[PDB]
Structure 1
Amino acid sequence: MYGWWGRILRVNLTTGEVKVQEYPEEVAKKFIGGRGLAAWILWNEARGVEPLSPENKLIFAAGPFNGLPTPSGGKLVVAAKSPLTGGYGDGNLGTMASVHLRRAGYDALVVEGKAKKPVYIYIEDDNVSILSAEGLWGKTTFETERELKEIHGKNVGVLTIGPAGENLVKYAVVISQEGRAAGRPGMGAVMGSKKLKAVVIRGTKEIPVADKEELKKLSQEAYNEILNSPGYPFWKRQGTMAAVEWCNTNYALPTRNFSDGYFEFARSIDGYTMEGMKVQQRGCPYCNMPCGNVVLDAEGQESELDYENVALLGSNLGIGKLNEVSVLNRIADEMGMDTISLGVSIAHVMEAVERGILKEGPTFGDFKGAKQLALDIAYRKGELGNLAAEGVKAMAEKLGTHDFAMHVKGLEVSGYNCYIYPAMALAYGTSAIGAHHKEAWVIAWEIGTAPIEYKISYDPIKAQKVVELQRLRGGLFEMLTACRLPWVEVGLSLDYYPKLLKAITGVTYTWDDLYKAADRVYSLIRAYWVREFNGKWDRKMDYPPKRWFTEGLKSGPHKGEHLDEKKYDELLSEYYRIRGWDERGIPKKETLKELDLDFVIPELEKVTNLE
């Protein structure tokens, strides 16, 4: 067996039992890795479990690309049943832990149970142990990783959670190297519910490879294709930050709880303001086009900036100064919570406060009051902070404000306002983990321009586009698992991936093999959702926030414009038609059979009727 090890590391924090599970090579070929392997595990071992209970499974999954020198192939998926959405959840993050876990001899690490006291998992090749992390509990993500490296060395990958993960904030995440995050859907809350403060990994093994020479040829070429791409220079300069100006110009910039797609102070928080505030640039393992742009915030501290971070904590909050948005950004990072869901919950609170619904709380443009709430959420302090720490869906039900609750399936909407973008909106509505642009960032295509550098329409081909993209971004790249930006941003030929896959594993994968493998994962995940919800499911699940229907842009040539229900409903049906799902968004027995997901039928039939 090449590329894959065929081994999964298992740790039971309740019994302290540690073992290695071997899985069949055909499971490897079938799901490839990352989100593929993660969905397989959660389907079998996370049936009906309470998201914050010890029975839920915290999965750290890499793919055949990880552990090896591959173009930006230092990513890693973190999956578990989501405490926020209640369905399947996962996220991705770059980290040397990805490299170590795999050189250590594992394709994945599954964690179950819950320790009696704060602990952290230590892995050094075959030497794996559960140690006390009692002295760490309470410390930021930055400090925890720092102290751990001060004991074990620099040659390690470290995953940690901040006070927000410990306090179980629904959108808490897992951090690494003061900047990389993963698990918007509560993966950090799960890691916290298990009394797991961190994971430290070091691996020195040689990962078996089918064609060593071709792996080197391909990698060198792909690396050089990046270096020589026309978009490399501007990418190096602004990274994902270039989307601020791009979204504003196109009215896709979330402003004041997505009330508008235009922000008057966008200049004071864009890639050009960022550029003049930069003091350092970091990146993920094996990446030659780093985009972890570090600036200094209004308090002299370092903040690693990303577009979604700034849009959600900046324009979305009505804050027009980047060094102040940078302060909030850093907090989210050390407290260990999702910048996106955190910004949407705060933005939600500001609107509600302004509407007279909430009596105490910050308003838009209120940096200080926003900074106090971000911290109050991190430590669940007081009534207001504890509520917002539950997310907008939960918060909405309590405050009775479904009106301006920007989420889909329970996950807060990303940094793209879609009042006039059917495809991107469909993208958000159909995301396998909930509202996210992860799997399908189609607004760029739908518009015709890209940050690296209009008449609405619900054309059926858009649903086809959203599906093709999801195969690549929500499928291939999440199973490899490598970075999509090289391809997305600087245009690296995708033809490199099936070839690298064949060089590493020895197995030929055609593009159809991949779309199928990708579609298999999408349906299995959709099935997991349905089963967990006990059959209570239908198309509305796949609907975008209702605000994009009842109101429209508040300024610009498209003022007043929004999305149309009837036409969106058809776009979706078309989507379901392509995927092979009924008008409830549930996969059909024929489709599941097609994708080798037969074993899923008996389980779903017990909760609803299949077609």
Structure 2
Amino acid sequence: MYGWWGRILRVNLTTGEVKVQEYPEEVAKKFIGGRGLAAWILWNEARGVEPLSPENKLIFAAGPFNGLPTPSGGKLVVAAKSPLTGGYGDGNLGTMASVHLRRAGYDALVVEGKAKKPVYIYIEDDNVSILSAEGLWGKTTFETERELKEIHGKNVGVLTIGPAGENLVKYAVVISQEGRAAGRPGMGAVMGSKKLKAVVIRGTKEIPVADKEELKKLSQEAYNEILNSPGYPFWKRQGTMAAVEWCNTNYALPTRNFSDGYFEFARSIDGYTMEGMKVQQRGCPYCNMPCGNVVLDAEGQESELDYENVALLGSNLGIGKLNEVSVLNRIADEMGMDTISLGVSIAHVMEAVERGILKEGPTFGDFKGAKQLALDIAYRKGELGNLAAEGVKAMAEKLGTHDFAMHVKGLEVSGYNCYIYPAMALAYGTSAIGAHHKEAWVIAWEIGTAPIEYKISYDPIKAQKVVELQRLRGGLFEMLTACRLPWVEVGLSLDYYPKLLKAITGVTYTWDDLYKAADRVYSLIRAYWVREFNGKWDRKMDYPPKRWFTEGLKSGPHKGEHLDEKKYDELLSEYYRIRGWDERGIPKKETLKELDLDFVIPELEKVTNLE
């Protein structure tokens, strides 16, 4: 076997047992890695488990591209049954831990059980130990990684959780290298529930490559193509922050809990403003187009800015000064909580306060109040911090505020306001893990323009475009696993991927093979949700928030415009037709058989009727 090790590191925190599981080359070829491998593991090992119980499996899954010098191939997938959504949950982050896990001889790391006290997992090739982290517990993510490196050396990959993870904030994430984050659906809370403070990894092994020279050649070509792309200069300057102006121009910038798609103060929180306050730039392993832009916040502290962070903690909160939004951003990284769900939870509180629903709490534009709430959420201080720490779905159940609860499947909607964007609304509605733009950022195509540089339509071809994008963004890139931005942003040819894959693994994958592996992952993931939800499931699970159907844009040429539910419903049926799912969004028996998921049928039938 080349590329894949066929090895998965297993750590049981309850028993202290550490072992290496060998999985068949057939499974590796069939699921490829990252999310695929994770979905296979969770389907088999997390049936009916409580997300915060010792039985949940915390998975760190790499893929064949990882550990090797592949173009922006320093990504890693973190997965577990989600404490926020109750379904399959995952996330991705660039981190040296990805390079080291693979160079240490493993394709993935699976943590089960729960330690008796705070501990961290140490991995140096074949030497794996569960060590006491009593001294680290309570420290920020930044401080935890800094201290671990002060002991073991700079040459290690470190994954940590901060107080939000330790306190089981439902959208707590895993942090690496002060800025890289993974696991919006609460991977950080699953990590915290096991009393797992960090993971330190070092690898030195040579990963067996089927064609060393092709690999080295293809990689050099791709790097050069990136360096020579016309978008490279502007990408180097603004990175994802170029989307603030682009979204504002197109009425897609979430403003005041998604109330409007335009923000009057977007310029003072945009990419140009960011350029003027940038002090450093860093990136993920093996990437020659770094986009981790670091600024100084209002308190003079370094903060790494990404578009989503700014959109959800800036315009979405009615906060118009980038230096202030940057303080909130830093807090999220330090505490280890998702900037998106954090911002949407805060915005939800702000709307409830302005409406008189909540007697106390911050209002839109209130930076000091937003900062205090962010901190109270991470430390679960007071009734408000505790409520908001649960996310908008849970919070809305308690407050009767479902009308303005911006989420899909319990996962908070990200940085694109879709009052007039049917395809993007469908992307959020059908995202495998819950509302996220990860799997299909189709709004650009719907508009005809993109950040590096209108008539509302429900054409069934939009459902086809979303499935196509999900195959690449929610499948391929989450399985390799590698950054999708070189392709998305600078236009690196997708042809490099199946070639790099054969050069590495020696297996020839055609685009249809890849499209099929991605579809298998999608149906398996959906199957997981259906099974864990005990068959209680229908098409409404794939609907975007009610706000986009009952309210419209508040300003500009498109004022009053919104989504037509009837037409959205028809577009959803088209999505199901293309995926081979029934009108409830559940995979059909024939579809499962065709995707080599026969094993799913018996289990799903114990819970509902299949078609």
TM-score range, shorter chain: over 0.9
- For residue 348 of structure 2, what is the aligned residue in structure 1? 348
Secondary structure at the residue paired with 1:362? coil
Q: Distance in 2 between matches of 1:339 and 1:65?
A: 28
Q: Distance in 2 between matches of 1:65 and 1:105?
A: 14
Secondary structure at the residue paired with 2:517? helix
Secondary structure at the residue paired with 1:572? helix
Secondary structure at the residue paired with 2:327? helix
Q: 1:293-340 deviations in whole A, cap 9, x for unaligned? A: 000000000000000000000000000000000000000000000000
- For residue 503 of structure 2, what is the aligned residue in structure 1? 503
How far apart are 1:409 and its partner, in Å? 0.1
Q: Distance in 2 between matches of 1:203 and 1:158?
A: 12
| 1:280 partnered with 2:266 | no
How far apart are 1:157 and its partner, in Å? 0.1
- For residue 565 of structure 1, what is the aligned residue in structure 2? 565
Structure 1, unmatched stretches of 5+, are none
Q: Distance in 2 between matches of 1:484 and 1:276?
A: 27
Q: Distance in 2 between matches of 1:444 and 1:281?
A: 26
| 1:304 partnered with 2:307 | no
How far apart are 1:373 and its partner, in Å? 0.1
Q: Distance in 1 between matches of 2:573 and 2:220?
A: 44
How far apart are 1:592 and its partner, in Å? 0.1
Q: Distance in 2 between matches of 1:31 and 1:335?
A: 33
Q: Distance in 1 between matches of 2:114 and 2:251?
A: 46
How far apart are 1:82 and its partner, in Å? 0.2
How far apart are 1:281 and its partner, in Å? 0.1
Q: Distance in 2 between matches of 1:184 and 1:452?
A: 26
How far apart are 1:72 and its partner, in Å? 0.1
Q: Distance in 1 between matches of 2:156 and 2:449?
A: 40
- For residue 204 of structure 1, what is the aligned residue in structure 2? 204
- For residue 433 of structure 2, what is the aligned residue in structure 1? 433
Q: Distance in 2 between matches of 1:448 and 1:118?
A: 50
Q: Distance in 1 between matches of 2:201 and 2:547?
A: 44
Q: 1:87-140 deviations in whole A, cap 9, x for unaligned? A: 000000000000000000000000000001000000000000000000000000
RMSD over aligned CA atoms reads 0.2
Secondary structure at the residue paired with 1:375? helix
- For residue 82 of structure 1, what is the aligned residue in structure 2? 82
How far apart are 1:445 and its partner, in Å? 0.2
How far apart are 1:183 and its partner, in Å? 0.2
How far apart are 1:246 and its partner, in Å? 0.2
Q: Distance in 2 between matches of 1:576 and 1:59?
A: 29
Q: Distance in 1 between matches of 2:225 and 2:553?
A: 40
Secondary structure at the residue paired with 1:472? helix
Q: Distance in 2 between matches of 1:188 and 1:447?
A: 35
Q: 1:324-359 deviations in whole A, cap 9, x for unaligned? A: 000000000000000000000000000000000000
Q: Distance in 1 between matches of 2:171 and 2:162?
A: 12
Q: Distance in 2 between matches of 1:169 and 1:181?
A: 15
Structure 2, unmatched stretches of 5+, are none
- For residue 447 of structure 1, what is the aligned residue in structure 2? 447
- For residue 551 of structure 1, what is the aligned residue in structure 2? 551
Task: State percent identity of aligned pairs.
Answer: 100
Secondary structure at the residue paired with 1:242? helix
Secondary structure at the residue paired with 1:175? strand
Secondary structure at the residue paired with 2:458? coil
How far apart are 1:399 and its partner, in Å? 0.3
How far apart are 1:151 and its partner, in Å? 0.0
Q: 1:439-470 deviations in whole A, cap 9, x for unaligned? A: 00000000000001000000000000000000
Secondary structure at the residue paired with 1:451? coil
How far apart are 1:166 and its partner, in Å? 0.1
How far apart are 1:205 and its partner, in Å? 0.2
How far apart are 1:379 and its partner, in Å? 0.1
TM-score (norm 1): 1.00
Q: Distance in 2 between matches of 1:446 and 1:122?
A: 46
Q: Distance in 1 between matches of 2:400 and 2:114?
A: 35
TM-score (norm 2): 1.00
Q: 1:53-75 deviations in whole A, cap 9, x for unaligned? A: 00000000000000000000000
Structure 1 segment 2-21 matched on structure 2, within 5 A: 2-21=2-21
How far apart are 1:536 and its partner, in Å? 0.1
| 1:419 partnered with 2:434 | no
Q: Distance in 2 between matches of 1:92 and 1:156?
A: 19
How far apart are 1:168 and its partner, in Å? 0.2
| 1:58 partnered with 2:58 | yes
How far apart are 1:600 and its partner, in Å? 0.2
- For residue 116 of structure 1, what is the aligned residue in structure 2? 116
Q: Distance in 2 between matches of 1:74 and 1:362?
A: 39
How far apart are 1:292 and its partner, in Å? 0.1
Q: Distance in 2 between matches of 1:247 and 1:520?
A: 33
| 1:127 partnered with 2:127 | yes
How far apart are 1:254 and its partner, in Å? 0.1
How far apart are 1:386 and its partner, in Å? 0.1
Q: Distance in 2 between matches of 1:39 and 1:403?
A: 32
Q: 1:353-395 deviations in whole A, cap 9, x for unaligned? A: 0000000000000000000000000000000000000000000
Q: Distance in 2 between matches of 1:452 and 1:349?
A: 33
- For residue 93 of structure 1, what is the aligned residue in structure 2? 93
